[PDB]
Amino acid sequence: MKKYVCTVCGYEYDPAEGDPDNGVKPGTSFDDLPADWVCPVCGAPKSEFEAA
């Protein structure tokens, strides 16, 4: 229940799912994501992500 969103394009991330774009398992936390990880939609850095 931490579904965040991008502050550039708007790509609701799923922590309970992960992220194949880069390679993440379900039940993971964004913060857990790598630094080289970025909104795989626009580009914005993970630093531009917040929990709405």
With beta carbons less than 8 A apart as the criterion, state whether 6 and 47 touch.
no
Taking CB under 5 A as the criterion, the residue among 32, 40, 42, 51 binding Ni ion is: 42
Cβ atoms < 10 Å from Cβ of 6: 22
Binding site annotation covers 36? Answer: no
Cα 16 to the chain's mean position, in Å? Answer: 11
Q: Which of 5, 18, 28, 41 binds Ni ion (CB under 5 A)?
A: 41
* Token pair belonging to 8: 């550039």
Residue 5 lies near Ni ion (rule: CB under 5 A) = no
- Of 5 and 18, nearer to Ni ion (C-beta) is 5
- Is residue 42 part of an annotated ligand binding site? yes
Which DSSP letter does residue 36 get? T
Annotation: binding site for Fe cation:
6, 9, 39, 42
